[PDB]
Amino acid sequence: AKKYCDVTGLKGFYKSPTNNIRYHNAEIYQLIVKPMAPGVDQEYLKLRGAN
Amino acid sequence: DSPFSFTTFGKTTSKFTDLIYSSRNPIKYSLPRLIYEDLILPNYNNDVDIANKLKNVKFNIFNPSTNYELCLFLSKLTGEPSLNEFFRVSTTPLLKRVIERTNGPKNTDSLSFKTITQELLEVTRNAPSEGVMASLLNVEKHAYEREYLNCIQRGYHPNVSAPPVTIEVLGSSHVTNSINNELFDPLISQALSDIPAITQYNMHVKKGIPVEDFPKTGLFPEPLNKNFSSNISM
Amino acid sequence: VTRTAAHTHIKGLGLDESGVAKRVEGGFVGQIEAREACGVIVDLIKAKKMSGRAILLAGGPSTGKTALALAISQELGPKVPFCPLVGSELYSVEVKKTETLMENFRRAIGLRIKETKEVYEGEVTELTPEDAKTISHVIVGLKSAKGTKTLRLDPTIYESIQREKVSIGDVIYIEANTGAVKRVGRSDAYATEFDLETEEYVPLPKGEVHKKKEIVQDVTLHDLDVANARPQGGQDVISMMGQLLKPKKTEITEKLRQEVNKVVAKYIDQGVAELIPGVLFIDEVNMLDIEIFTYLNKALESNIAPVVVLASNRGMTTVRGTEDVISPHGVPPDLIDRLLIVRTLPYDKDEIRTIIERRATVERLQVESSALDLLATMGTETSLRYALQLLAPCGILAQTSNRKEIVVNDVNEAKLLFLDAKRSTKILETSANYL
Amino acid sequence: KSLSLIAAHSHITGLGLDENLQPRPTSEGMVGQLQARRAAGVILKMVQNGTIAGRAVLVAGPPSTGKTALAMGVSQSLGKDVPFTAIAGSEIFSLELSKTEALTQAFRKSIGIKIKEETELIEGEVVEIQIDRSITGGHKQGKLTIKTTDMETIYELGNKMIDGLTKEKVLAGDVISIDKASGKITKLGRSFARSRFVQCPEGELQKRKTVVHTVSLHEIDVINSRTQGFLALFTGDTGEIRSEVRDQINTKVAEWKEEGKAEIVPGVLFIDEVHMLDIECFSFINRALEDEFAPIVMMATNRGVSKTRGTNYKSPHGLPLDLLDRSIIITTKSYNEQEIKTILSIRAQEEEVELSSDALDLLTKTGVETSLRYSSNLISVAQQIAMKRKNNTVEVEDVKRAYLLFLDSARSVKYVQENESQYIDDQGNVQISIAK
Amino acid sequence: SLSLIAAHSHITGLGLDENLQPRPTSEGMVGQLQARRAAGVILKMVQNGTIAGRAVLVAGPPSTGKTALAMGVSQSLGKDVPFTAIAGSEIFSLELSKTEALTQAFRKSIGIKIKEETELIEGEVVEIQIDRSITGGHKQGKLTIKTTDMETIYELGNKMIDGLTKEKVLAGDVISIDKASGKITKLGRSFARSRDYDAMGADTRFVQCPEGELQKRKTVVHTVSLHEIDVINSRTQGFLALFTGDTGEIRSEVRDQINTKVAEWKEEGKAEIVPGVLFIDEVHMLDIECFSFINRALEDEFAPIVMMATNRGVSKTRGTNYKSPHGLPLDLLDRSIIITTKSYNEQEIKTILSIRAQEEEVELSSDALDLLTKTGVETSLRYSSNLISVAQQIAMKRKNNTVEVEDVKRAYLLFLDSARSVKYVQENESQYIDDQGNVQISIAK
Ligand SMILES: Nc1ncnc2c1ncn2[C@@H]1O[C@H](COP(=O)(O)OP(=O)(O)O)[C@@H](O)[C@H]1O
């Protein structure tokens, strides 16, 4: 299966090891993936069913 | 006391520990992708392979399909019972002609006879000591055993030891496989080594492979002493 | 953008259908009779009937001998072989000089081979080999962006496929006529089996799996000689590091030449090949030793020898290798009997001015008429080449002062800055310690 | 990089010229020779335009008068990424290569091809590696987490990068650059963690960088000759590269330039002491200078009406007139006392020598009396005598002691003429004994 | 074909009668009656074969026909008799001595003749099958060979099986097997299996399936020079040394052993000796060492008949500081018989020009032929012999098929001989580079 960024739907290059969400590049990582509240990750990964 | 290692390898910045050979040369010859793609490797827009066939196969003068008279002439000259041997001689490199040389039989009705020097050589293969031909043909080993050369020490060591210069091409795996095949050719590296004995016993008895189907091994020349086999001195 | 180096304004001999030259045509100014001789030699060469015909064109220096040879090469075309050569090149340290002369002779006889190219490339979807320890055949299915196509293949090709480490999902390159196997890499569809992988991922080929292409192969006789005369042996297709032993050139025996001639003769009459003889051009032929001049005699009488063009700019000069043989143009009287001598007259003022204007045109420089007359008087006073080589410093010194056009003062500045041979000799004679 | 102690022309950093190609009195370590510097600047703009080729320039003058200094200034002001080959006249008399073949190699070494290509690279900071193996090692799985100063990631690796990571062993705390296409692992070093030393990379992990490549004609000629590999570029056994391979290279560079995948940069070939060449070399040179792929040749000589080698007659500058017709000649001149004083001051500041002013005037006087090079050579010896008596400034008697100790040319000729009975003459006659 | 119109291609042998009396114009040779008679005597000397070690000289002025006589005796020599034509400058090598170069030139032109009987089984293999015994020491093979007319079954031994896994055939490859010697080859693949494998690969070739009778008897004759035997028996694989020339100074004991076995084969009766002719054109640039080696190498029983040609007058010999007749020292000239050519007259020049233009397929007029005959009377013959070829091209430049006098006059004004070039150089000597490197380049003083 093809891998994609969970935020924008772009092509996913990296997966953050703390919370296991794929992202595209630096800005989406820094302003989305790092400072997000807990409980958002489980509804982000519910879309592809990875929880 | 060792030669200086002019190389860069994986060093540790300190149920088993695996060590892999990773010695490389510090000098790197950086080459672009365009030259290697457009002049070495064939593609649709160049004619490397077509010219190679047209120069090596079609217009080869030892082709039996076109120069059968020349093949018969050279077969009468050499007395070799295969007409395709000249094609196989002319189209493989030198060391490939070296390491699988087989002492095949040649017919008597030919012109390549036994040279008197070659007959003098061939007499003294399995001849033992105190024979007149063997003693006249074994001067150098007599000088080896009389001058006590097998227990002599080593006085000279090289100062720098370096690997061959690594060529790098960024963005291509074919160059990496080709370079790994050229540096670590398994046929030549098996010719420059030997098979372990338990491995041989697994070849012959436990797997049924006969002895004459083995890859050729043990072509490395022996050093003069046990001391001369290495550059590291204790 | 574009480069010029004392040439490339020469496009041809500038002749009409009757073989008469115009005054200024093809980049040539003046020099009628030598151009007629060159056109007749071009027609004789295009007749494709003769072996060993020789031509020597002689004259003073800076007269256009090399320009005439290049005009011959341009009028003949790029299909016919043309081998430029300096006479000093025949002195090699690896083989004898007569050997190198024979290779430069046989470099001027070309061939035209009609060949085809068929190529299979694309996605590997099936690798199923079958036996009857020894495989019988392998069936490989190839896939591209315009459809799939399965093939049957022989185990000899399967050995190269195994050598190339080809598995399911790779993009390969199969040339059916030669048997070449090339691995490009893994597909873009298999890029997500791992996050980090050591393989390179390429997209699918956008064309069809099977492509056909007609090609024309040109080889000379010297390539066929050197292909059968390798002393070490044959080489593989991919050789990035050379053999451990150095192969040097060896003298090639006449027997191999006889067999190569037999093979080419057996291939010509079937219509496969087309024989094209060409030109061996030797410049500065006075530099040759007498033994090369004697072997030139025997080499010119061969049945496959090309048309040889020589040039010289000497007078009553002793040929090298001798002490008291005064001969015209540095050619001995034995070889000069078999030659045909074309003279080359020098130029006057107006043709030198026309040449200066023509070369200023091709270098995209704009000169006034007053500077043009000064450059013409400079060329007649000093040398034609000295007026030739001051054009680009004049352009630089005009461009320095934000000008696109040459004035007289830039020519005077370049006159003061750069010297010719005679002013340098005058400074050399009136000097104290080694200029 | 580019280690160098102190060279003879190390004080020259380029041609001192303004934007209107005019020479300054003193700029970039060069004084004097205004018209020669202007002509070399014209040559520099001629090369930098690059629209013409195959033009030969002869530089002639008296010895020890700014010739090799001019060539070093041209080479320094050319900068990098332009091929510059500096050969001597005696480098072509080889025993394994012929003279014309060596000239062809030196001609093709000065034309470069500019190639631009891109290669995506991964470079970051290794935090933690996990390795799981079986008993036989048939199946291996691994996790690699890696980072920059900006981002964080974890990577699932196949077995081949596992093998290529246990080869050239990567530990935690390491800075590694990873190539995805060829699988090359390079250890840049360890990062800043006290718990060599380099910094953690910033920006994106998967960087796509372009590089500008330069390759000479001679490199492609060696590679496309299938008889020897690229080791002949270093070992030097190219061994008489044929002509059809050169024809293929010459056609394919034009085929590359018309498709726009490459550009050709021209360079300068410098043949220093060109008067030591043979006549057969010059004869090759007149026809080699009219090629499309020929550089601009700079030649230097100092002989005057000398015998050309390989002949029996005499020619101006040691070169026959057919070669001199194809050349434009720059002429240098001798130096005044003020220019010699300026050169000596520049060489004093270069070698970190402190002088007294009267010692500088003495050096100027003995420089305009004997030679420039003798005065430029005594200035290093006098500093050592100054440090032998433990003082920094070089005074007049410090230079005088070096003048007494170390000899010049004409004085030595005078004592040779005075005491020739104790030396070996041309006839091999000497006297050794002091008595009778 | 691969032979263009050479300088002397019209010469097909020597135009002699039965009683060695030369015809005036026959077999492409015009005139030179005593020279052609002497060359016929030398031809009968070679065809006799019982005289060895004789050296002749063809000495004459340039453009007279010495190498024309050599080409004639080469063509009238016939086939299977060795004829080595070298120049005088070919023996100055860098990896071979001049002595060994003359040795190889001496032994390249003496050959032995070998006759043998060949029986060939050439066809397409239908099916192979191998029988293996329980002990495995003996093997049996069923061979199903075929041609387009008849097919049969042959029994095989273990040795052909071992040699048949090598260069393995795949039931449809064309092979040929000898019965008397066991010669094994693979000619290639039949055209019936051409559309089979869809990519034939690197090491195959497509040949036609043979027709006719499968079992063929054919006697072929091989002529082998001695130098071939010395270069084969000097190494392990000497045929690469045959075709690459890197023999590298073969020793002398191999030569005397080959001479002894050649004498043994002659007395036993397997082979017969075929002597040949050695032609050395322009022998006058040989060193005195080469001359001494020649006059000693002419006294051996296995030595050919040497033909030398020269055109120098009384000139110096290279390596010394004195002059000699014909450029050769008198010790060599003592062991020789000299053939002297004579210069031509009007009618022989006209006949040679007519024969050359007929050979070159050039159609002329009578007036143009007379003008070119006068030109070859004043100038040399070869100037007219090239002028006919240039004037022919000028003739089809005018859309005319015949050669007129105007084309000859145009070619004469366009193209110069030696004398006009010497005159025009000596008139304008300031514009040419002299022996001291002085030339007035500029046109204005
Ligand atoms: N008839 C002509 N028309 C135009 N240019 C000419 C003519 N003759 C000579 N030239 C130029 O003059 C130069 C003479 O150089 P070259 O021919 O090399 O000298 P040489 O004839 O001594 O070999 C050439 O570069 C050529 O461009």
Ligand SMILES: Nc1ncnc2c1ncn2[C@@H]1O[C@H](COP(=O)(O)OP(=O)(O)O)[C@@H](O)[C@H]1O
């Ligand atoms: N214009 C200059 N500026 C600085 N140094 C110079 C100048 N001209 C000459 N020199 C010095 O003179 C010395 C001789 O110069 P060089 O050109 O190498 O010798 P030659 O003139 O014999 O070729 C050099 O060491 C250089 O430092």
Ligand SMILES: Nc1ncnc2c1ncn2[C@@H]1O[C@H](COP(=O)(O)OP(=O)(O)O)[C@@H](O)[C@H]1O
């Ligand atoms: N007797 C002859 N019959 C026919 N052609 C001749 C005769 N003699 C000479 N020729 C022709 O004259 C041409 C030049 O003579 P050549 O044989 O080269 O003289 P030489 O042997 O002295 O060099 C040759 O091409 C040859 O064909």
